[PDB]
């Protein structure tokens, strides 16, 4: 579902060779990238957030 | 911290600086522009316009009118040359 959003974002980036000199658009890009990377890292590393009282207790 | 928005700010200033001055300079003269020799006014008649069209035009632009003027002044001056001497 996220593929369309960043696909169009980098399509705008490919169009953005002419609006060069911007300050925080690229900064906001790395901000989104860092936030989504932290998303997928926390979702991958997240073990089942419950104590297995049947066995692990 | 947020996303500033450059890509739609061209409204306040048209893209480019040097050609902006030439845009108004070259867009305005095309309205009142002759398509192809409009109103040539190549025909006129004021007892001297025919002479201008035949001889004083840019098509020929030769030295013949000067020689004709010299011949005319000679013809005019012959009479008073006889009158004086």
Curated annotation (Swiss-Prot), chain A:
GO terms for cellular component: mitochondrial inner membrane; mitochondrion; proton-transporting ATP synthase complex. GO terms for molecular function: proton transmembrane transporter activity. GO terms for biological process: proton motive force-driven ATP synthesis. It comes from the Eukaryota. Keywords: Acetylation, ATP synthesis, CF(0), Hydrogen ion transport, Ion transport, Membrane, Mitochondrion, Mitochondrion inner membrane, Transport. It is found in: Mitochondrion; Mitochondrion inner membrane. Present with 6820 molecules/cell in log phase SD medium. F-type ATPases have 2 components, CF(1) - the catalytic core - and CF(0) - the membrane proton channel. In yeast, the dimeric form of ATP synthase consists of 17 polypeptides: alpha, beta, gamma, delta, epsilon, 4 (B), 5 (OSCP), 6 (A), 8, 9 (C), d, E (Tim11), f, g, h, i/j and k. Mitochondrial membrane ATP synthase (F(1)F(0) ATP synthase or Complex V) produces ATP from ADP in the presence of a proton gradient across the membrane which is generated by electron transport complexes of the respiratory chain. F-type ATPases consist of two structural domains, F(1) - containing the extramembraneous catalytic core, and F(0) - containing the membrane proton channel, linked together by a central stalk and a peripheral stalk. During catalysis, ATP synthesis in the catalytic domain of F(1) is coupled via a rotary mechanism of the central stalk subunits to proton translocation. Belongs to the ATPase d subunit family. This is ATP synthase subunit d, mitochondrial. The gene is ATP7. The chain holds residues 4 to 60 of 174 of the full protein.
From Swiss-Prot, chain B:
Keywords: ATP synthesis, CF(0), Hydrogen ion transport, Ion transport, Membrane, Mitochondrion, Mitochondrion inner membrane, Transit peptide, Transport. Its main location: mitochondrion. Coiled coil: none annotated. It is found in: Mitochondrion; Mitochondrion inner membrane. It comes from the Eukaryota. F-type ATPases have 2 components, CF(1) - the catalytic core - and CF(0) - the membrane proton channel. In yeast, the dimeric form of ATP synthase consists of 17 polypeptides: alpha, beta, gamma, delta, epsilon, 4 (B), 5 (OSCP), 6 (A), 8, 9 (C), d, E (Tim11), f, g, h, i/j and k. Belongs to the ATPase F chain family. Present with 14600 molecules/cell in log phase SD medium. This is ATP synthase subunit f, mitochondrial. It comes from Saccharomyces cerevisiae (strain ATCC 204508 / S288c). The gene is ATP17. The chain holds residues 7 to 91 of 101 of the full protein.
């Amino acid at each position: 579902a996220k593929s369309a959003a960043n696909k169009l974002d980098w399509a705008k980036v490919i169009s953005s060779l002419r609006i060069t000199g911007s300050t925080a658009t690229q900064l906001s890009s790395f901000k989104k990238r860092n936030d989504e990377a932290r998303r997928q890292l926390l979702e991958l590393q997240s073990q089942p957030t419950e104590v297995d009282f049947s066995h692990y207790r | 911290v947020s996303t500033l928005i450059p890509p739609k700010v061209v409204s306040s200033k048209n893209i480019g600086s040097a050609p902006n001055a030439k845009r108004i300079a070259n867009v305005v003269h095309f309205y009142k522009s002759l398509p192809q020799g409009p109103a040539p006014a190549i025909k006129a008649n004021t007892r001297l316009a025919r002479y201008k069209a035949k001889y004083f035009d840019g098509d020929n632009a030769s030295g013949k009118p000067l020689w004709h003027f010299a011949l005319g002044i000679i013809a005019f001056g012959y009479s008073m040359e006889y009158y004086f001497h």
